[PDB]
Design a protein around this ligand. Sequence first.
Ligand SMILES: [Cl-]
Ligand SMILES: [Cl-]
Ligand SMILES: [Cl-]
Ligand SMILES: [Cl-]
Ligand SMILES: [Cl-]
Ligand SMILES: [Cl-]
Ligand SMILES: [Cl-]
Ligand SMILES: [Cl-]
Ligand SMILES: [Cl-]
Lengths: 298, 307, 298
Amino acid sequence: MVKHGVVMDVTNVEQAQIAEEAGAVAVMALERVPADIRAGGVARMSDPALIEEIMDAVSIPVMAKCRIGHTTEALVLEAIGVDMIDESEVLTQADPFFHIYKKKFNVPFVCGARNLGEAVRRIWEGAAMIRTKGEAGTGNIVEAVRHMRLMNEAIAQLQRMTDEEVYGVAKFYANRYAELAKTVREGMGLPATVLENEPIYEGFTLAEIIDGLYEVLLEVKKLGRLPVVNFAAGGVATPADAALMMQLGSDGVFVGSGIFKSENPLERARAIVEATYNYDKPDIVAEVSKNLGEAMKG
Amino acid sequence: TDLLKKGFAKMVKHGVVMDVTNVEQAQIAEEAGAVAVMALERVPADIRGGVARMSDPALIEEIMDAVSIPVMAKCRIGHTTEALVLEAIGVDMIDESEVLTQADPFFHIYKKKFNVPFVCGARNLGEAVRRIWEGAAMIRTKGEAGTGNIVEAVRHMRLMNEAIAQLQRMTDEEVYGVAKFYANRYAELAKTVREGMGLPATVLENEPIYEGFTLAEIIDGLYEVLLEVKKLGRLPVVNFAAGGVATPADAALMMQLGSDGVFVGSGIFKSENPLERARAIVEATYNYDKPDIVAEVSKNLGEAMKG
Amino acid sequence: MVKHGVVMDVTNVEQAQIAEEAGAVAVMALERVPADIRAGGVARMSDPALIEEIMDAVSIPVMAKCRIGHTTEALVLEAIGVDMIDESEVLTQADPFFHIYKKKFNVPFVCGARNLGEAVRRIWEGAAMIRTKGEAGTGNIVEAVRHMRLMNEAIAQLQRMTDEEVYGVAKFYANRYAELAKTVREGMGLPATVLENEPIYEGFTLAEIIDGLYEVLLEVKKLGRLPVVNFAAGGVATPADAALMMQLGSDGVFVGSGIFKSENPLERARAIVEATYNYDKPDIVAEVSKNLGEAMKG
Ligand SMILES: [Cl-]
Ligand SMILES: [Cl-]
Ligand SMILES: [Cl-]
Ligand SMILES: [Cl-]
Ligand SMILES: [Cl-]
Ligand SMILES: [Cl-]
Ligand SMILES: [Cl-]
Ligand SMILES: [Cl-]
Ligand SMILES: [Cl-]
């Protein structure tokens, strides 16, 4: 799994090679970048043939997207051998109630998160990497910033809590899993309530899910950060944007439309790669920003 | 004790426990056939203007020396020290009773750490389960002591029986839900104190609230007692009826409702012919399913109590 | 100041001598015990002559009551030389807005408290001893128990808080001091609000009072108990009652009506003294309880 650097979205062999040439740590194989996905009806997993061509074209890791909760799409990506699967909200959600139970898979997953509650639930489900996102395709960095701020402030507050108070937070975060059970009971003419000792997700009862989230939260509390790699995503369009996210605590960044939707892709890609690596060196970020050309509209 | 506590209780079942205020009454109770006596300075009917506390240990000892049957005594709810005193003088069983003036508004005595067995009152299943988890070796489905009106005792036994009948139709997961609801009463103090400090009246389930136990641990404890109740179809301890038993028919009625025995306070010594009355209630309790016997011992008993 | 034992209320030389004979650690000189005070219109400080006679009659410390907020009554007790002044709610309150500013006096004060908020405010004002009371004159121990329970549970919860959270509690407790200022502003046609930097009690602003309560609360947090001697009071009528309060954490007990309103005062007084000293010895409490006679009605 990738621990740092820039992950770029590519839609063909030429873009993947450019990404690898620019210094990307990995590429995200998809048929259409986020910006274009949002003209477009139902966005699904990309054709395995396209993903395999990109895999053959480069030496760095290749990732692919699958719809939220779409277990078979994920099993397919795992079968063709992608390095990491991204259960993304960029594509059209397939299961309105649950995300894939990622722990059962061998291939690692990266999941999006808007806040600590989402991150913890995603990590408990098995995510090996979190991408704190706001909204891809906009080219507006405010998205990623809002959520990284929310993520940092929540972890800072969690560190001031006793374990008992953290358990209380875990109990609050677990409630989302019982939405289906409550809706069903109501549909059967009964109160929209659930017993904490009845199975609701992958055989786990609400009480067991609470304990699972609690353990993840205790690690977050101990580390002062998420227990898995955390990249910022959505809105990164300039070298300064990438450097901003790194200063906010990100371990790396995802770039989709920002590069291939700009005037000089290869040039801008190198610059974002440089700014991410030298995020605390204003002169370098400044230099790589000179004469980059038109950025994505957004 | 553990096994010794329930051991004593099983030997009093099917009998009548009578309240006595002196050697003469205690003796009358014994010759009448009581299985045991409850020593106290004033019967519940008289208790109900001032503060009713534990009886002078000297009076209890005099009664213990006057009769060969076991002797019980009352202590105020939550009064750990009164209970410790009664245990030291050697009573056979302590009754943490609501007939006396409650001493602790938040908690009942933690009975499990005592050697002597306790009998506690209960108006419904929730109360019985909490008293039992606290250590009660015996339960008395109380009513309204001092009124001579059996309706209170009947109401609560009806509530107890119906709740147990509904509990048996539940899955273990559903029973846990009931245990969770029953445990909330223990967090009252914590919530009130938090509010007094300017914060939401809520509590964390892993913070200690009673005798070092957290809400979470209390729920598991109540859950285990409820499972026993479900398995047995009744309380896991001896359950006597108490309240307004004033006639032989009243005692027989409670037995038909499922009571293991009865407590009689004012109904005997606040009547015209104590000894005769006591004898009739004893026989009616032993032969609650014998209309002819119940009728027979009821004839020419004289005036009863009222209230 | 007294640190343990039994403080008894006496109304004459004979009772004081009995109290001293029984083993009291100190006596409370007053014209009428709490039980009788409540037939009775306005209850005030006792005649200095009666207090001086009791002082001469015994060798142990003598205390006297003064009305809440009655500074001159307190100065009088201090002038005749009482060992401790009890600003008690048993007497008719003299100042509806504030308690005496006890720090200015040389003689120590004992104040009542129903909960932690009251204890902290009283201690900040200068109290050298707190009596966690419920309601004297009733002979019903439930009063003292309720408040000792509230006191213990509040201190237990305070120990689980960070200093920042304790400051929040101090801020909440300080509000009571601004009641006068708010009432006055409203009477002048303006919003019932106050500025935290305006003087409201003894030259102290709300902000300074908050800091004062905060410091007291930090000591409570550090010690796991109040920073001054704490006796239980109100309702103690039997040796078992005294022993109960000691098991609940009290450093000692106050007894008023319980002794001289019973059948055998001297006998019952000795027994309560013994139970308080041997509160963890059931056999002794049991033995001293035998044949005590009639206790106070209540
Ligand atoms: Cl979620
Ligand atoms: Cl909780
Ligand atoms: Cl439940
Ligand atoms: Cl992080
Ligand atoms: Cl209860
Ligand atoms: Cl039963
Ligand atoms: Cl106050
Ligand atoms: Cl202000
Ligand atoms: Cl204390």
